[PDB]
């Protein structure tokens, strides 16, 4: 066991799956990037710090690039036309059991399950109503 | 559409599921709450605004009760020993089409799928190693 | 479900019932007015805010108009000769269960039930003695 | 008349009713209390004065005990975790006849009838949505 | 009850219809935006405020994009080549009853009815002649 | 060919219809006024001008009178008790073809179509909720 492993970030059903792999842990920040140039890569980072005396805080970030090829100076360079940024902070009391922590993980994945309100809104460029 | 409905936040497989239902919409912030006192409820909120000239941000917040040794309906203090707080900010460039937003949603749910490192670190009360 | 619906404010037994309907939610204040001109309308507003860390506070207001028709500049305008103002603030601890909250609602309606002391005093232009 | 009598504040239909009885009249403020320690009692007070040259105000206050997980007769601290506070101010113009005051009472009890939005938001621990 | 919902801004047949869905209601400004890239989206906002003691004033705004692709350096972005901007202010005295408001609405829709002088001048890049 | 003609501003059935007829076109401002006393008349004006190098800007204005009789000193005059004032500005870039102008017109009439949120909020003395 070492949980610092590769995983598939975007499952496009076997074909065109975006999978991300361990790439750095300098300064206590675990980083995973996809197999692209650093200019076009998906990136995921994660770090935990004991924020208060009684809390721990996980900070997770995801960058999703829209790839493009730009001509700069008559030369074509692999580029990301824009990136989208997910940025999440989770603060957990030190008194939380592993069963308490599993509840948090289940709530977070239920939140984004296909068909529930929030994933639907995002995917439609809509708000909730 | 009409996104603002009840949904299952914690799926304990039919029996013991936690459903969260619409409870407030003041200021266009959708709130969903479970059937509990506000000090012990699972609570979810979501809102979207154009954050910059180039971006929109979804701000999503979740609060999850510490359940081990909980006294249902009891007054449990300090509040911070009994609650976890999730805070997600998703910044999406105004150029993202709906297909782009679909992919961002898939990246978000891939991050948290069971078995992948981030959910299993959280649930095991661990960092990355 | 959306609890922002129309309701009858004054039940004059089917005939001359004053009924009030959703009319605004700007700035998180739900407003209902009766079907009159804005100068002669009954108005009801309601808002909830988390006042303390451990409290929530509902602020409810009702305006009851005494309608009249005034001649201003030789022209007759629909007007309210005076309004009566109910103004109520309810502070509930976050530790209150929904069964605890039902008790509050039952106490508030028992307070104003026909025949109990306070409704009788108001209706008679009397104090309590 | 003689308004100042006992009445049923919470009608749980015959069995489990909460009756509140006259308990103080210092300064012409009528107080009614239930049969409990003053820290756990249902308490009601009511007074009236001419607030301005044109208006009278009834000030009515209610305190309701948090009952889930209550220890009867116990010392429960903090007080604020265990109590809800209602505060109503009714301003009625000096022109209002008794019929006018009857209607104001009906508006007040319509606001709180079961099924109408404000009582059902409160009881469900919710805002308007 | 809610009027902050999705609606059809352009029935352009029953297929190329443009629909606008609720996006944000911050600060008393209801905003609706069509789906796909915010950069090519239609936008509608509406807010109402008491402009004077006697008047309420609605401000409604609509933006109609000309959809296009910007290509710079080989990178293509979905953009709006330009936007037409409708901006309207409707002032209504508080003495207007609901019937007077209905009439104001019929005047507005008569003004823009198909075949009448103003809609057909606009539709033809033309003035009055 | 002429679009400066009489037209129906309010089809209020096929009988109480309000028609506005050309009155004056001085200084590039087309004005139409309904018949009988100018004091109780509906008024519509429209003017178009090149607001910038790239834009033309239409200014359309409508006034809706509340008909009434002023009686002062026993002398009665037909007056408007008050007027609602619609004022709209539509900016269109010179690149819009006639088809783009048709679409702008369909957006305008969709906005005010019967049953959609803005016309029905106005019609009911209401905001968005």
From Swiss-Prot, chains A, B, C, D, E, F:
RNA-binding found in the keyword field: yes
Region annotated Viral RNA-binding, chain positions: 31-104
Location in or out of the cell: Virion
Pfam families in the record: Levi_coat
Keywords in alphabetical order: Capsid protein, RNA-binding, T=3 icosahedral capsid protein, Translation regulation, Virion
Signal peptide limits: none
Main location as per UniProt: virion
Family to which the UniProt record says this protein belongs: Belongs to the Leviviricetes capsid protein family.
Protein name: Capsid protein
Organism: Escherichia phage MS2
Lineage: Viruses, Riboviria, Orthornavirae, Lenarviricota, Leviviricetes
């Amino acid at each position: 066991a070492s949980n610092f492993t590769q995983f598939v970030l975007v499952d496009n059903g076997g074909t065109g799956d975006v999978t991300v792999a361990p790439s750095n842990f300098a300064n206590g920040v675990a980083e995973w990037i996809s197999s692209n140039s650093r200019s076009q890569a998906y990136k995921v980072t994660c770090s935990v710090r004991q924020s208060s005396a009684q809390n721990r805080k996980y900070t997770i970030k995801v960058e999703v690039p829209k790839v493009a090829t730009q001509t700069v100076g008559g030369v074509e360079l692999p580029v990301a036309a824009w990136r989208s940024y997910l940025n999440m902070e989770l603060t957990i009391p030190i008194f939380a059991t592993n069963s308490d922590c599993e509840l948090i993980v289940k709530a977070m994945q239920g939140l984004l399950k296909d068909g529930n309100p929030i994933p639907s809104a995002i995917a439609a460029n809509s708000g909730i109503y």
